[PDB]
Design an enzyme around this catalytic site. Structure first.
Site, mmCIF file in Angstrom:
data_model
loop_
_atom_site.group_PDB
_atom_site.id
_atom_site.type_symbol
_atom_site.label_atom_id
_atom_site.label_comp_id
_atom_site.label_asym_id
_atom_site.label_seq_id
_atom_site.Cartn_x
_atom_site.Cartn_y
_atom_site.Cartn_z
ATOM 1 N N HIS A 131 83.645 44.818 37.202
ATOM 2 C CA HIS A 131 83.773 43.974 36.043
ATOM 3 C C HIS A 131 82.518 43.819 35.165
ATOM 4 C CE1 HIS A 131 82.860 40.200 38.488
ATOM 5 N NE2 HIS A 131 82.044 40.121 37.470
ATOM 6 N N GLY B 107 76.409 34.525 37.344
ATOM 7 C CA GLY B 107 75.419 35.600 37.660
ATOM 8 C C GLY B 107 75.197 35.927 39.168
ATOM 9 N N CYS C 210 77.423 37.278 41.016
ATOM 10 C CA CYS C 210 78.271 38.416 41.341
ATOM 11 C C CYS C 210 77.485 39.589 41.833
ATOM 12 C CB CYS C 210 79.127 38.837 40.139
ATOM 13 S SG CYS C 210 80.411 37.661 39.849
#
Lengths: 306, 306
Positions: A41, A143, A145
């Site tokens: 993503h 952030g 991820c």
């Protein structure tokens, strides 16, 4: 003595953390030898969030679309591919801090450590369980991820989790290291929700064993139970059904303490029915379910305090 | 979202752990530049462990009797001295993994991460507080001595604890990195016992601010209290008295939320008097006291370490 939610030491994973940027989206990546792994993503635009087609988004990128940095040092991308919900970015340098590693897909109820990172830098480490419904009750901000979940056996890192998203209840969802989601989730902003969850019965029994090894017996009783009769009560308190395999896993803790598994189930049944009457176990006022039998055996003495 | 007890990433400390052996006694050491620090009781013998004369025993130790291993590398001892309850062993190799570091003495109520270690090999990492009674509620087995506690500030490791011993209630005692004990304890086998402990009010307040920052506020009210009235209540519940200095330490959290400390105390007072009526705060059913005002900021704001 003592008992605390302990993480594996994070250094072997710290040396693999990088930053990955595509457009103006940035997140964490995992750099092993000559490959960087991150949530796909990273390639999503401002709108694409709702209905991205990832094949179509990715074909529109080249190697040089991706900026990977180890600290402030750029690693050049020399190839890329998508594997399920991850990207695999080949870079022109190898990571000499790459530890001996495997990728593993863990089962719900298993525990692991999470190295929470932002912009490719480590923030903190904590220990958690994968819930029976596959979500994690984590601590993640925007952030985070691409931070990873792992266990360590001797000097070998078993990576088991990569963080992708947060659900409306504020629990977390992600993938294994082949990019397949844990639980029935997809990487787009849609109406998705955590499923029904249960208490991890196997781990609550393990933790009652830890309390015995550490010297405490107040919650035991003179009763036994059948596996069946135990489940008839515990399933009323939203506990996962206990099978004979789970009974078998408790054998070694049973032998160390001299308390038969079904006698420990009889104790639990009583705690469920009667509560703890303001008492504590290993300092907790509630029944804890984030330690597996294996965690208890790793942390507690091999010698019971009789 | 979510809130966890988070440890500092432990990598910079793992690179410092070694094993120190004297005859039959093995424990852990901290290797910084060309010095290894460890508990002075490594020179003790299998049973010579009640009331040793350390100065006399060190007299008969030569450099070569200290065996120091870093992984599988032998580090030759070329010098030794005692400093309070520690040995400083000079070795012939400066640690290439030495981080930027400081030695600091932690104050009661402040937290740090512990890197549990056995045979010089790091095992696990957890977060604890220095209790008001000068013990830590750690998790340590035989062979853990010399494991260290620390904080990180940007790229600088502040070492604040080295493990020496377990007390009869199964709490733990040790020194700072100058070898001076926290509390009245001594590194021999006497009758020494932990005093009664109290709840760390400064940290309970910090964690209630964290709850507010995270959207969990239901426990706030429109009232205030005086410091004296608050202390009369808190002292009933076995909480440490709140001083004006603690009120000032909570200043940044108070400014951020617009909630004056004495207003938060009036919230706390009602919580203690009435309990939570089955509600949770940051997922907990109890008031957590092992998060400092400094921990709160670091978790809420995603501070990282390089």
């Amino acid at each position: 003595s003592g008992f605390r939610k302990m993480a594996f030491p994070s250094g072997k994973v710290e040396g693999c953390m990088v930053q990955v940027t595509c457009g103006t989206t940035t997140l964490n990546g995992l750099w092993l030898d000559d490959t960087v792994y991150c949530p796909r993503h990273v390639i999503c635009t401002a709108e694409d969030m709702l209905n991205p087609n990832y094949e179509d988004l990715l074909i529109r990128k080249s190697n040089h679309s991706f900026l990977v940095q180890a600290g402030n040092v750029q690693l050049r991308v020399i190839g890329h591919s998508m594997q399920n919900c991850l990207l695999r970015l080949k870079v022109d340098t190898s990571n000499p801090k790459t530890p001996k590693y495997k990728f593993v897909r863990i089962q719900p109820g298993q525990t692991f450590s999470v190295l929470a990172c932002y912009n490719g830098s480590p923030s903190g480490v904590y220990q958690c369980a994968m819930r029976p419904n596959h979500t994690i009750k984590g601590s993640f901000l925007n952030g985070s991820c691409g931070s990873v979940g792992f266990n360590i056996d001797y000097d070998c890192v078993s990576f088991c989790y990569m963080h992708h998203m947060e659900l409306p209840t504020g629990v977390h969802a992600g993938t294994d290291l082949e990019g397949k989601f844990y639980g029935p989730f997809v990487d787009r902003q849609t109406a998705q929700a955590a499923g029904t969850d249960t208490t991890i019965t196997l781990n609550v029994l393990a933790w009652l064993y830890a309390a015995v090894i550490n010297g405490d017996r107040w919650f035991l009783n003179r009763f036994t139970t059948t596996l069946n009769d135990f489940n008839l009560v515990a399933m009323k308190y939203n506990y996962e059904p206990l099978t004979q395999d789970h009974v078998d896993i408790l054998g070694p803790l049973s032998a160390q303490t001299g308390i038969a598994v079904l006698d420990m189930c009889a104790a639990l049944k009583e705690l469920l029915q009667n509560g703890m009457n303001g008492r504590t176990i290993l300092g907790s006022t509630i029944l804890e379910d984030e330690f597996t039998p294996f965690d208890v055996v790793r942390q507690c003495s091999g010698v019971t305090f009789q």
